[PDB]
């Protein structure tokens, strides 16, 4: 059904695309420098560097600064992906996408300075409590549905959905971080990337694929939130891939009938049948019986009561994050990889 509510969504996305393309075509660059910030503590790590809590000297604001070593990016063949990441993040604008405040580079590193989201990773809370109730999981899932509706309308694919990347803010709502695999593409793409538990079968099998891989990954996320473990797990990645492509999924006995039905349609190997990829697009998902209680506009406006509010001891506190070994930020006296990253 295409009624008044659907036309409002359409008009909202049209204006959102006008604003995105202006920034996509004319990206911001070199908007701060390293000594504008005091470095406080590491919030997480990855293959190219680390995300650090920092304090902006001139305002006293706290931020999260992602640091990438240019030489390590080159060795991992992630140059173009890193240029994608920053060009996309500086252009997007949505309530559940973390905001990029500054970016710059020096002889050794690339820096993206984002809003600090103090509540910690969904991953931490999910592992500690075991599993979320279905209303809890539905609250978070609705935010991801709207965020993918926004991203996909801009021809963006996200490609790394997982609880490790979903931060909980002070109102209890989600902020998506890490756009290292995000890509703007019309038609199909072919890169083998993501996280093993969340890969769609068409990625594993080296087919061309499109935004339907994000909807598969949503199915994995909802399952993991409500069960406490992912639908395909093993000790070695090859064993995970064999389960993903097999065509078989089993559900905990406490999953509601509606939840199992939604997940059978999201975790669908047949692309002609996977929810999110049919003629009705995202509306097959938004109108599924499992989402009957979800007021999509109220979610977008952050007027729904959150399942929990993270503990907050004060500004700059990190109690909702694990501790990591601290390593220096070394800046070489010689410029590294300048031509490769000239547009950053």
């Amino acid at each position: 059904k295409k009624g008044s509510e659907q036309e409002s969504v359409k008009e909202f996305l049209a204006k959102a695309k006008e604003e995105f393309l202006k920034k996509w075509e004319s990206p911001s660059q070199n908007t701060a420098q390293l000594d504008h910030f005091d470095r406080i503590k590491t919030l997480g790590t990855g293959s190219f560097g680390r995300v650090m809590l920092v304090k902006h000297k001139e305002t006293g604001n706290h931020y999260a600064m992602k640091i990438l070593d240019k030489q390590k990016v080159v060795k991992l063949k992630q140059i173009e992906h890193t240029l994608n990441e920053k060009r996309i993040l500086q252009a997007v604008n949505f309530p559940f996408l973390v905001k990029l405040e500054f970016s710059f580079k020096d002889n050794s590193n690339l820096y993206m300075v984002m809003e600090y989201v103090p509540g910690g990773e969904m991953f931490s809370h999910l592992r500690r409590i075991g599993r979320f109730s279905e209303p809890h999981a539905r609250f978070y899932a609705a935010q991801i549905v709207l965020t993918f509706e926004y991203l996909h309308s801009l021809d963006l694919i996200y490609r790394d959905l997982k609880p490790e990347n979903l931060l909980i803010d002070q109102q209890g709502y989600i902020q998506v971080t890490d756009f290292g695999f995000a890509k703007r593409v019309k038609g199909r793409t072919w890169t083998l990337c993501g996280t093993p538990e969340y890969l769609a079968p068409e990625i594993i099998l080296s087919k061309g694929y499109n935004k339907a891989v994000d909807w598969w990954a949503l199915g994995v996320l909802i399952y993991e939130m409500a069960a406490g473990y992912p639908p395909f797990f093993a000790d070695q990645p090859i064993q995970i891939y064999e389960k993903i492509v097999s065509g078989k999924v089993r559900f905990p006995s406490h999953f509601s009938s509606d939840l199992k039905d939604l997940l059978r349609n999201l975790l669908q190997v047949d692309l002609t049948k996977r929810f999110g990829n049919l003629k009705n697009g995202v509306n097959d998902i938004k109108n599924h019986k499992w989402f009957a209680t979800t007021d999509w506009i109220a979610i977008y406006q952050r007027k729904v009561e959150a399942p929990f509010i993270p503990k907050f001891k004060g500004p700059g506190d990190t109690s909702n994050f694990d501790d990591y070994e601290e390593e220096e930020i070394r800046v070489s006296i010689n410029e590294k990889c300048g031509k490769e990253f000239t547009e950053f």
Partner: peptide
């Protein structure tokens, strides 16, 4: 139980991208 199998597995910590 499937939960007990997950908790004893090697992939309950943060998962790196490929």
């Amino acid at each position: 139980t499937t939960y007990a199998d997950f908790i004893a597995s090697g992939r309950t910590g943060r998962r790196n991208a490929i």
